[PDB]
A paper describes a structure:
p300, a major human histone acetyltransferase (HAT), mediates vital biological processes and is linked to diseases, including cancer and neurodegeneration (Iyer et al., 2004; Lasko et al., 2017; Shin et al., 2021; Wang et al., 2013). p300 acetylates histones in the nucleosome (Ogryzko et al., 1996), the fundamental unit of chromatin, and alters chromatin structure and dynamics. In eukaryotic cells, histones H2A, H2B, H3, and H4, wrapped with genomic DNA, form the basic unit of chromatin, the nucleosome (Luger et al., 1997). To study the p300-nucleosome interaction, we used the catalytic core of human p300 [p300(BRPHZ)], consisting of the bromodomain, the RING and PHD fingers, and the HAT and ZZ domains. We now report the cryo-electron microscopy structures of the p300 catalytic core in complex with the nucleosome core particle (NCP).
To prevent the dissociation of the p300-nucleosome complex, we generated the catalytically inactive Y1467F mutant and removed the autoinhibition loop, which is known to block the catalytic center of the p300 HAT domain in the p300(BRPHΔAILZ) construct. The nucleosome core particle (NCP) was reconstituted with a 145 base-pair Widom 601 nucleosome positioning sequence. The p300(BRPHΔAILZ)-NCP complex samples were fixed with glutaraldehyde (0.1%), fractionated by sucrose density gradient ultracentrifugation, and used in cryo-EM data acquisition for the generation of the cryo-EM map of the p300(BRPHΔAILZ)-NCP complex (complex I) (left). The structure of the p300(BRPHΔAILZ)-NCP complex shows that the HAT domain and bromodomain of p300 contact the nucleosomal DNA at superhelical locations SHL2 and SHL3, respectively. In contrast, the PHD and RING fingers do not directly contact the NCP, and the ZZ domain could not be visualized, probably due to its flexibility in the complex. Although histone tails in general are not clearly visible in the p300(BRPHΔAILZ)-NCP complex I because of their flexible nature, the N-terminal region of H4 is appropriately positioned to bind within the catalytic center of the HAT domain. Therefore, the complex I structure likely provides a structural basis for the H4 acetylation by p300. The basic patch on the surface of the HAT domain, composed of K1456, K1459, K1461, and R1462, is located near the nucleosomal DNA at the SHL2 site, suggesting that these positively charged residues are involved in binding to the negatively charged DNA. Indeed, mutations of K1456, K1459, K1461, and R1462 to alanine substantially decreased the binding of p300(BRPHΔAILZ) to the NCP in electrophoretic mobility shift assays. Additionally, R1137 in the bromodomain of p300 is located close to the nucleosomal DNA at the SHL3 site.
Residue numbers in the entry:
A (entry chain A): 38 to 134
B (entry chain K): 1048 to 1216, 1223 to 1523, 1581 to 1661
C (entry chain G): 14 to 118
D (entry chain H): 32 to 124
E (entry chain B): 20 to 102
F (entry chain D): 31 to 125
G (entry chain C): 16 to 118
H (entry chain F): 25 to 102
DNA sequence: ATCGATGTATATATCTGACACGTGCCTGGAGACTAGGGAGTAATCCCCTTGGCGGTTAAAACGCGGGGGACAGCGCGTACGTGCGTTTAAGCGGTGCTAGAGCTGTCTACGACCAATTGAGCGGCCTCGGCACCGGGATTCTGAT
DNA sequence: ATCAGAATCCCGGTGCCGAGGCCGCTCAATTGGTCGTAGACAGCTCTAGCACCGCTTAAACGCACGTACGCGCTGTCCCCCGCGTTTTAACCGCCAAGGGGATTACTCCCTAGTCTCCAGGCACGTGTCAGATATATACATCGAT
């Protein structure tokens, strides 16, 4: 048959996803997660759907930035595969925690 | 008695938690001055005033010997405000907010102090009927009229009646003799005192029953300090007498659970707790039509049985399924000969593991069909009727989050059970009543099985009188209601005609408490035995089992 | 003319900007040239962004400016990128970029 | 209830800059929020500065130095030029 | 209804697509857990602020403006939802 | 000669209440002064932005309490709110 | 006065005047300055207590900026509060990364 | 005068930071970075002064230039 | 005798992390500040306290930057901080664009 | 270096609902006038900055020997990518229920304003003891054998 | 391990200048009273959130296989380091000159406030075309031979 060598479908996906702008986290699981986290602070809270959408946008932006900086670290370390310590190192250096 | 500083240190944080609620706290921080606040009738309604300052003071000055006295005052303050102020008012909703903060604060503190819990508990309010109409009912908190705490009337159907005199049954009572009152009464849970440390605990939290442990209550704290354990509870489900039927059913269930091998499965115990002989009498319409001309028996003998399934949950027995059946033997006249009918079944949704619950109910029913088939009963009969709202078939006061199936879901549930029974070659086949009648070439109402409490005896009365002498619309009535009525063939065809006598190897079991559903519902209602939560169901099971063991 | 915006040869409203400068408690008294200056600088910045946004949109062969075009115009211009360094544009997307090392050889 | 906004003004500016281009409602909202953000930044900085100098009035000088502080080099230069040109065209008539 | 274990709703291919947008080429199998943690640590810092605004104005619906303000406070402002 | 103010004597009083043996150097005094000024500025600004968000024109104790719950980390915020409510209650009660 | 009428140590009048003059809002409720002074006083008590502890550990009776820097960086919640502030003559926490230490 | 930041001065600064062994191009890179940071802070301080109609940059101006950039500096009378 | 390379550095660390005195010579830094201010406004006078404040700020910033650089250099399996580390730490912090 | 199989861009037809414009309505902005204080400006004083000269000595600069770490290459093991078949549940479209957001109208308690008043706090003076410093000793690490 | 050999901590004695206490006053906080409105609160409307049910199909999950990459190891080399010696210019002390920061007094003109009038702008409705979507085709390109 025909089988792409490992490492080219990754690049195709990089281009395809950097080209488009749609959301990437599934809407309903993220909504349920947000409600779960909020229920810990004040029981029986109702969420304007626009607010859940804004939360999802902010989380997507934060995670994309974090993965960008993590990939930059992992390239600095003479590697190619981002790893959890990279995420944690990038956030430590950025001044966040 | 705790040292007053011990109490202050422990409880004051819970009081501060209320104080620091702004603005909710403000109306409650000082004693209500009725006149200053522009409210003169306050002391006509509120007879035991209470507020945060008064409570703080009693706490600072060591006026509480034990923490429940603090809790009682807090709740007095709250209920005073819920009493005087309108449900829609400002103070009312503020009060509600404080109480929520309090419930969350108080529970872990009380537990730190060696207590079962810190919650304030009260039983579910009973539903009040109405002597005015058949199934009229009174709603919680809404106003109603009563006489001798026996005859109650909804504010509507009370004023309906022309004039000023009511009639109760055949004697006449002036309306002025009725009490006007709100259905807002809730009975508190009871406490039991540790005989060693003296702490008061919820009787239902600790499951202390005086018959089972007559020496007295000793809390787990006190027991562990001396490395003791409670004496064994001998009033268990397992120790109820075994029967061939109970054994057969429980073996079927436990063999199924063992095959599934799901984590955290428990053993199920099934017991038959009642078996007696009874008769159903043909009602006056049908009796005038067919009995008096000798075309139908005036009554039919059957055996009724009650059975229950139990599981151990958190070390304690839990009754989760109940069922009553009517069995019409081989000596019974046609049309009832060799038939079984399910009078009613009911459940309490605490079975573990959840994802095998329905399967287990089905195994109980399939096993029961298989068992009576073996005895030589040819046919089973099921009326799929969910309980109406606020009625319980067997278990008093279900969990409010246990959903009640509508008729289509309940029908499909019975079909799924029967389909499994067919695939196991227990049930030969089954049909709705209309199709079955068609197949039996039925022509007359006297040919329909006649069961105690069933739909068809009642609708036949109605039909005969509507038609002024009547069978006329029988097929039409069957077609109309057909999805609800199952006829289940256990023994088919020529074999059903030459069977030996039905001989039940199990003995009769006299138990008045379980002769039909009413007695156990009445007991439960009279003794606050609810099945509305895991803890209350565990208590209620424990009390039920004592009653069954002690007779 | 009548409207104070016309006197300055502007397009943004100077009256509304003046009202806002009073209402948010930024100072006891608001001058009379500050609203004009602020409306002018606001208009200039908006024109500056919309220029590049329209250009990037015409690059993608479209007529309507959508959030992606604004994101591109903001993240491509060196200077705007610094003024708007810590703002996430909903539906924006990111700049297409791949590190050199990740590319195949 | 009337809800104030900067829609028509941004639209006029767009028509001046790209006479044959329209702006989607979402981009309209984005610009409507960006103008609010920049105006808030500039006004807050001018307020803090006027408090620093123990002054009780926001005049064009404060707004000018606030623009000098907030925007980077070239944007600051052009914006200051625009501000002075507008205030002169105003005071002239 | 009570809610639990919804954090697994951030599926492995979801984090994969996210990283693929950021410019990553090969993800170590240990990322899919760690990232989830990080995400939680972010949300517990935004909602806890949004709620605090809502609990202030005596409301029970967290409005989009509340989330936008909670974000703007953390130096992570968000254009496109109101202001 | 202008009369400039500060928080020196108050920080001194607090220090004497909390470590009676201990003195404070002049530079540490300036640092504590600037720190108090900065925290007060943050809290006042946050209360102002709250009041504006709710379209209300007064900064009452509620906005201050919410600003404290927003600015400070968990334990410090809880303790500060407790202190605040205690002080307000003792103020309003007595006279 | 009012600082005494609330059991506080910071000045309430001064905080009220500062709330008025600084133009934070059109008006200022009478309850706000008391609460604000109480919060300020508590935070200062915390910082000074930690600094005094650190100084006593250093065999000194007079708190100096180094002790403030130590009492701020050592504690966690305060470090999170005062994240982006630099203290003149403050110094740095003593720490050496593990890899650097000799083998 | 950027050569005024001597090599052993950067060595001491780094030794405080916690490094153990320093390369040879650090010195130049650090000179560049410090020049940039100083340019920014001094530009903001100047702008403040030039507004206040003064010709002497006061410590308050530098403290404000820092507080603006999110680098608040305690100990100079903020 | 001779200290083996790698211990005088550790002793210097232990000594400098304990003290709080300033590490950049006052007069060279003052002349640098004046040179840089020469470009924005001619003939400016600097309050000496302001020069001290500038020096404290620059010291704090450089110390932080070297700390984060050392973190990067240790993460990359090395021990010698290098200009790319400085630049990488600053890029990740988000300080430089 | 070709072949082929796959993905991507391009060219065109169809349909839709989101954007552009036209209209009525109403309230926020504009115009004219006035009273008042905040700010501009002149003058003065004295603090604090700049500039400079001499010495002293700590620190910067430079050269050298070499040990240790950066870096390149290699080989090994496996964790991750890719594709495929199977299974889960998100997405969509309705359908109903209603708590709660939002607006309005009434009323009053709370905060701004102002005059009189006095003590809390700030500026200045003066003392002593907490810490800077120094010399001597005890202890503690580090490196070669 | 065991020695020498520098570094560092401890202890005690001397001194000095910065913090802490005390005194005078003056201006800002306090008290008392009045007046106006911002906000609390009750009541109403009705939208947007929540729940639910069924059907479709994209998307997630599990699994097998292979390979490109992480990583540990080893060798080479050059480059920072520690140290000794020579050079320089920071630092401190002191003095001298003058700019401008700060303060005060005076005057004016810029703005807040008030009223009265009307047009810019928003909600609403309606009409159509830019773009989404589907389909056929030409080209790019990636990998095996």
């Amino acid at each position: 048959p025909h089988r792409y060598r490992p490492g080219t479908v990754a690049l195709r996906e990089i281009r395809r996803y950097q080209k488009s702008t749609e959301l990437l986290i599934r809407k309903l699981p993220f909504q349920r997660l947000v409600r779960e986290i909020a229920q810990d602070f004040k029981t029986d809270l109702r969420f304007q759907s626009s607010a859940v959408m804004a939360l999802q946008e902010a989380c997507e932006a934060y995670l994309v930035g974090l993965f960008e900086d993590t990939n930059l670290c992992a390239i600095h370390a003479k590697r190619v595969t981002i790893m959890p310590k990279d995420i944690q190192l990038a956030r430590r250096i950025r001044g966040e925690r | 008695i705790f040292k007053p500083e011990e109490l202050r240190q422990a409880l004051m944080p819970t009081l501060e938690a209320l104080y620091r609620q702004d603005p909710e706290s403000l109306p409650f921080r000082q004693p209500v001055d009725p006149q200053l606040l522009g409210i003169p009738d306050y002391f006509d309604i509120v007879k035991s005033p209470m507020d945060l300052s008064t409570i703080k003071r009693k706490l600072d000055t060591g006026q509480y010997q034990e923490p429940w006295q603090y809790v009682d005052d807090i709740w007095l303050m709250f209920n005073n405000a819920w009493l005087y102020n309108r449900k829609t008012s400002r103070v009312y909703k503020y009060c509600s907010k404080l109480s929520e903060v309090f419930e969350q604060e108080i529970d872990p503190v009380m537990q730190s102090l060696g207590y079962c819990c810190g919650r304030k508990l009260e039983f579910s309010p009973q539903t009040l009927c109405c002597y005015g109409k058949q199934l009229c009912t009174i709603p919680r908190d809404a106003t109603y009229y009563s006489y001798q705490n026996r005859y109650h009337f909804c504010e509507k159907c009370f004023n309906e009646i022309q004039g000023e005199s009511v009639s109760l049954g055949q004697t006449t009572i002036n309306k002025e003799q009725f009490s006007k009152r709100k259905n807002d009464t809730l009975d508190p849970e009871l406490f039991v005192e540790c005989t060693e440390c003296g702490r008061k605990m919820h009787q239902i939290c600790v499951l202390h029953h005086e018959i089972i442990w007559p020496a007295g209550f000793v809390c787990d704290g006190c027991l562990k300090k001396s490395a003791r354990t409670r004496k064994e509870n001998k009033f268990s489900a397992k120790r109820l007498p075994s029967t061939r039927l109970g054994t057969f059913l429980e073996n079927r269930v436990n063999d199924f659970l063992r095959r599934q091998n799901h984590p955290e499965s428990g053993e199920v115990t099934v017991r038959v707790v009642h078996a007696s002989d009874k008769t159903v009498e043909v009602k006056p319409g049908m009796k005038a039509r067919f009995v008096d001309s000798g075309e139908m028996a005036e009554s039919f003998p059957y055996r009724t049985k009650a059975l229950f399934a139990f599981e151990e949950i958190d070390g304690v027995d839990l009754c989760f399924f109940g069922m009553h059946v009517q069995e019409y033997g081989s000596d019974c006249p046609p049309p009832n000969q060799r038939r079984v009918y399910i009078s009613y079944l009911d459940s309490v949704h605490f079975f573990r593991p959840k994802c095998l619950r329905t399967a287990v109910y089905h195994e109980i029913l399939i096993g029961y069909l298989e068992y009576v088939k073996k005895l030589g009963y040819t046919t089973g009969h099921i009326w799929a009727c969910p309980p109406s709202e606020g009625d319980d078939y067997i278990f008093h006061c279900h969990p409010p989050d246990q959903k009640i199936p509508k008729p289509k879901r309940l029908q499909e549930w019975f079909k799924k059970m029967l389909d499994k029974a067919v695939s196991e070659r227990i049930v030969h086949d089954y049909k709705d009543i209309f199709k079955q009648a068609t197949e039996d070439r039925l022509t007359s109402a006297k040919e329909l099985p006649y069961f105690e409490g069933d739909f068809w005896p009642n609708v036949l009365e109605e039909s005969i009188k509507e038609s002024g002498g009547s069978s006329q619309k029988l097929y039409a009535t069957m077609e109309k209601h057909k999805e609800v009525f199952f006829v289940i063939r256990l023994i088919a065809g020529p074999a059903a005609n030459s069977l030996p006598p039905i001989v039940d190897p199990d003995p009769l079991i006299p138990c008045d408490l379980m002769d039909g559903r009413d007695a156990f519902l009445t007991l439960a209602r009279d003794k606050h035995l609810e099945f509305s939560s895991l803890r209350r169901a565990q208590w209620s099971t424990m009390c039920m089992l004592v009653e069954l063991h002690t007779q | 003319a009548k409207t104070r915006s016309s006197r300055a040869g502007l397009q943004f409203p100077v009256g509304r900007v003046h009202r806002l400068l009073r209402k948010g408690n930024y100072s006891e008294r608001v001058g009379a040239g500050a609203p004009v200056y602020l409306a002018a600088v606001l208009e200039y910045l908006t024109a500056e962004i919309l220029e590049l946004a329209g250009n990037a949109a015409r690059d993608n062969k479209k007529t309507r400016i959508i959030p992606r075009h604004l994101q591109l115009a903001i993240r491509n211009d060196e200077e705007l990128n610094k003024l708007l360094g810590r703002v996430t544009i909903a539906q924006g997307g990111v700049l297409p970029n791949i590190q050199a090392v990740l590319l195949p050889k | 209830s009337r809800k104030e906004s900067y829609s028509i003004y941004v639209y006029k500016v767009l028509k001046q800059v790209h006479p044959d281009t329209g702006i989607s409602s979402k981009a309209m909202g984005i610009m409507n929020s960006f103008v609010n953000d920049i105006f808030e930044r500039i006004a807050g900085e001018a307020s803090r500065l006027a408090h620093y100098n123990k002054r009780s009035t926001i005049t064009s000088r404060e707004i000018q130095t606030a623009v000098r502080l907030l925007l980077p080099g070239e944007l600051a230069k052009h914006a200051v030029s625009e501000g002075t040109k507008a205030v002169t065209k105003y005071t002239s008539a | 209804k009570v809610l639990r274990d919804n954090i697994q709703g951030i599926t492995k291919p979801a984090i994969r697509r996210l990283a693929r947008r950021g410019g990553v080429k090969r993800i170590s199998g240990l990322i899919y857990e760690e990232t989830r943690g990080v995400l939680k640590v972010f949300l517990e810092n935004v909602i806890r602020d949004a709620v605090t605004y809502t609990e202030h104005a005596k409301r029970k619906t967290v409005t989009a403006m509340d989330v936008v303000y909670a974000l703007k406070r953390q130096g992570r402002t968000l254009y496109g939802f109101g202001g």
